[PDB]
Assembly symmetry: D3
Homo-oligomer: 251 residues x 6
Amino acid sequence: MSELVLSHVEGGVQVVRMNRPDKKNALIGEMYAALAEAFAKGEADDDVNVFLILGSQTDFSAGNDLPDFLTWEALSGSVADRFIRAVAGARKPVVAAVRGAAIGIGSTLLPHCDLVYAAPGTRFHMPFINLGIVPEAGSSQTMPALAGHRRAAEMLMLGEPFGVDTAEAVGLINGVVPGEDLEETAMAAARKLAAKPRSILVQIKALMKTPAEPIMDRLTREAAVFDTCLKGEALNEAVSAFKEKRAPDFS
Amino acid sequence: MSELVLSHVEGGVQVVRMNRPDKKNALIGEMYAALAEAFAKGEADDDVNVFLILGSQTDFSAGNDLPDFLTWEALSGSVADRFIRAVAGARKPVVAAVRGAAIGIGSTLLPHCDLVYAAPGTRFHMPFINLGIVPEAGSSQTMPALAGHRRAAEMLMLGEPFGVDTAEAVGLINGVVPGEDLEETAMAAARKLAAKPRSILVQIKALMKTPAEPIMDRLTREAAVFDTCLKGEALNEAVSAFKEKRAPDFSK
Amino acid sequence: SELVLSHVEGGVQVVRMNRPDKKNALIGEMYAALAEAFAKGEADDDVNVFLILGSQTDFSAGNDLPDFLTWEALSGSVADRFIRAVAGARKPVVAAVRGAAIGIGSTLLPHCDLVYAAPGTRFHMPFINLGIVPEAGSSQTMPALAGHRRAAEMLMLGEPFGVDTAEAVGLINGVVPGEDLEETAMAAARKLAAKPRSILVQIKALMKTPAEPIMDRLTREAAVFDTCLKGEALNEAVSAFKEKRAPDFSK
Amino acid sequence: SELVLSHVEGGVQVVRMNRPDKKNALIGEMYAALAEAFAKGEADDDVNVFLILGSQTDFSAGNDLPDFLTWEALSGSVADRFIRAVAGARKPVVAAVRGAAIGIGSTLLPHCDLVYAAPGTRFHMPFINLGIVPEAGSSQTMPALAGHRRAAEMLMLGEPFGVDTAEAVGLINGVVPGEDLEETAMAAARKLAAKPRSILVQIKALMKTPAEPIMDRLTREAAVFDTCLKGEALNEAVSAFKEKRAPDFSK
Amino acid sequence: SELVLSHVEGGVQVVRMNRPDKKNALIGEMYAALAEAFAKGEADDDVNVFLILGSQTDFSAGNDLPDFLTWEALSGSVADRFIRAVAGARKPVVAAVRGAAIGIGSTLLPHCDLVYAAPGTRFHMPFINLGIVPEAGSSQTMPALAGHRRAAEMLMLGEPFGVDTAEAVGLINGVVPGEDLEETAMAAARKLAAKPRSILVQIKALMKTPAEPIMDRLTREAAVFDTCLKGEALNEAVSAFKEKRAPDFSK
Amino acid sequence: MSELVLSHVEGGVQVVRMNRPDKKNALIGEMYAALAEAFAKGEADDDVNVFLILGSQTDFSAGNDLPDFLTWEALSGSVADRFIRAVAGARKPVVAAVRGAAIGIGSTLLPHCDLVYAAPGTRFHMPFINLGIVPEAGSSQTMPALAGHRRAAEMLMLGEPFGVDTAEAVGLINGVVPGEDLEETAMAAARKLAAKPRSILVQIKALMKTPAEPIMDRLTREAAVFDTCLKGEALNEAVSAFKEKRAPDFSK
């Protein structure tokens, strides 16, 4: 319920844009709610294969609106918690395009995305410690996993901002793209995902995101899924299309 | 002459070479079986300390042969599954030297190797998604662990090929070596492993490959093993050799 | 009592190894003094952060060989006690390394929160060449940081490596000229000491909690986060922001 | 001569080597056709930019060996003509490379303005192994780009190298999956073609002017710059900015 | 209140651009004040090093557009005077950049001796998009630093770039969190200021002497070097070393 | 006339080793002289194709002996100047293996080498400014050319030491190699150079080291040399060897 979040579907891609550009997309409760709603619609909508999350023309998100944030009674059960769970649990792929400010949740959300592109000026920051609080959105797990404990301590314990150099080096983003081409490029990546066979793609994502386990268990797990694929129409169409020297159509 | 998988032992190293060069070492059932055979033999063979896996002079492996692959009833229990489990479970060290094509299993095998060198033109690819299937050989776990989820998504979800830059950056390979020296260099690394005390080296590998656990448990685990080493001949030989100003010989 | 020096300044407990003539090769007395220093610091309310240093030329060449040939076991030994003391330290630990960082000189570093190294620091885990196995959790930490193959150079080939690798795999945060090394490490310790200790400790504990299913981690972080919303540290951060001043978290 | 294909689209002259059966190993007729294509493009007012391509599998394996053994000289040869045509081209040149880039396939690239390469690309300058010296200015361009030692691996050891090195020393802009390589290179060519030609050409000429004492270069740039202040391209840029629209530099 | 602030502390002349409301977009009066500040600092015996700063959010968004449309020429202009003042400055120049570094904000940096940037810094040389050419020697300095192809992304495609590229091509020395940026740049300025000025200046002049045949350069260095052997700076360095103290090169 | 520098020839490689390990190979006049002599001999010796420069088992060179250095009347025309010119002007290839200290001349020499390998603990330093002097050996030109002006200013103006990370990134060294394999690896690189055809290799090096010039002039220059190679025995042997499916022997 706000014009602060815009959402629409094009060619199998649900575009979800934060739209409070005057405050650098600093988030408030109504935006979290609209964002959670957009994920729930997209997750249930058969015309949607992939999500694409965008910000303004100058910023992704400056994180929570600070006055608003100081009035939170809890994080547990809050609307912010709902949004984060909606993204962390999304079965469909999620692409993000970031630029300018990516602060707090603007950064800690990115590890739940499948692909992320950033503009040259992007500034990442997780300043929880400087507000007397702890990190959210699973960043206490995802950052050390990606960057190692020491480089993640610069982010979380020193509370220091970082740039695209570090973000790409630790695997937080896939690459840096000039702002004028950023949305087009992220959209091209979304389409390329949307042209894969959804039911398989979703299984791949779910396996990737399954907690790590003893290797023999994982082999068994992958193989069980794999067996089902051998019988499927997607494989059939992929082979057929390869033979006939054409692009597959997986609808 | 031209069996599809060649195997022989030199200086503690079992060389296992895929040899279907005309099809860029695209794998069929018989190769998987021969390869699993070679691992079982090397694992049991007391003259073998280390494996070295090689391809042709131009390619490592272009993955499964497609005609053969369309014959599969299942991956579970198949001969390909057997090969993969043989490598994933190998107690002895495994060195690989890759070049040209490393596709499908040619790539997804590499995380189970202990050292890997690649030639400059190597092309890595996991195109499962473009065939309507899912990744195998534990790559759904090993790729995201090595590269992080987003780079691994380029590999697995976009199904895009990648090169030696990425492969080295995410720790899939140790380094890039000019093709004319690739085999020699991989072999030198194998020999260097083979000269270590086998019984200890195997324990180090097993620890390294033990699933991660709470840190205090791991300390306890390492220490238990470590305690047995303090009493061992390998330590004794290392110290003796140091005192007598000579290179240790751990071959006994 | 001359081989290990310890003192507290500005919330930082400095712990220095001081056997420079043998490149800080450790013996039982040092381990005991080092373990004691961590126990004191962990209990001392005036201490927020530890800073571990070596000599002016070396961090540590690892165990002294004569002493080592006296060990009955690693389990239960004084070396074990030291290692546990660091691995289990609730407060942050910063290290500054240079010259030799061998054996325990290297395998200790993954338990540190920040680590700076001089140009020409030489890292080495030569356990295999002594017929023994790696200690201090390195069989887990090195593969997690470097990946299995690059860790196999270190642990299976037993090869030394340099600052290039150490930084690339996240063993250290950066390389700093020797003449500025201690000052820089100290500045980083002070910066950590100026954070709110009770929150900082929670952040470290979350970061070091074994990875778990993502929804569980979200729940875990949120439970801690909820407690922070009611805390003095948040209150001081806000107050300080309002009054246009730097926060003092000695509260 | 269907060994070289050339055509113009949207201001871009596409020049494709087309002897896929021999991995585009070059012979005299190809060099002549290539030189002709550059001369046409350089004189053609409908052409703003060149795009040079190979087969679907290779860029060029260098000189065909049988042909090469018949050369009386490099000086004055048709190969020399081609090289000079590209080195001297006033308009921008984009290349997309893959598979083999050997001999001239590599040594040509420093004359290009933008270069994209596929993941499997193999670069090689094996002159020393044939008892000859490097050509196409590589004795100068490689040391300038890579430094003398890394260039000695290429030229004195005669070792092939990959995309890691090529990107690190600035031989190529980036690595692009083969299925998107041509599209991406073409997009870059179009982007260049949409710039104001007369300015772009000046920029390229300045960039390629031999380095000189800094004050001379300031003078040189400024003289050109002064002419631009009076030009239509500036005028269009400003007009377009005022009217809140994209500029059209076709005028 | 004035648009350029300048003052001296501990041998360092701080020169700060101060039009924060327009992101330090430059006008003629600033160029004149900046050139004035350099002339003064160059002559002033109490000054050893310059430190150039911007606002708390931006370095410089380049020329103010209204002012720029007033220029009759770049040759001889006040902008030219400023650029020459920096390019020709005999004393060392350190810069600390953040936010916008556009046009001259970027093309100035190659004339600096050290440069630190904040995480969000956005570098841009959009000359081509304005129908003009690059200035401040960038047609020479960018290709030298980045190689021709990566420089073509900056100058021919006119694309902005970030701290990843800037550090990789040697345009900056490092990235530093905004809250520590000025302090760190200052610490570097002080460290330069504590060197012996007359020597330091000679080192800078040699470094900036156009490249020449190697034997000539050896001869050149040696001639200067011979003069140093007789100098007070060497004498003070040795003396200070003997007496186990820090040298004071104010002599 | 000193045992402070050891020199000998093996398999076309002249090994030149600094041998004052007690002072980390800090250089004095007699070492400069012996080193210059070794280059002059090698340059004139037909059995020598390549130089290999080595230090002690722990250090390359800590630079000039400081007490000695404070007594120099001049650098121009000194024995140190002679050495530097000998290496800078050497027509034959030069490979170096460095470790531990590489200070002053220990660093500023390396840009005149064709290949350089370094051990993990190597510490590079050009502290001229802290001694009130300027850089030597062409470093005022070579460092900025390699590293760019700003990173070179850390080295030369701030006078700060740096490590193998930076040295490899700016192209000062080819790579890092574990100390126990350093000399072997550098030697292998020397031998690989020594197996190339000397007369051609020398021309390649001379072209590489020719000052940069307008591109058309360089094309002309290369082509003139190239024309001479088309008539040479080295090309002939390369082709012949290729046809007969054997390794070339460029010894004659």
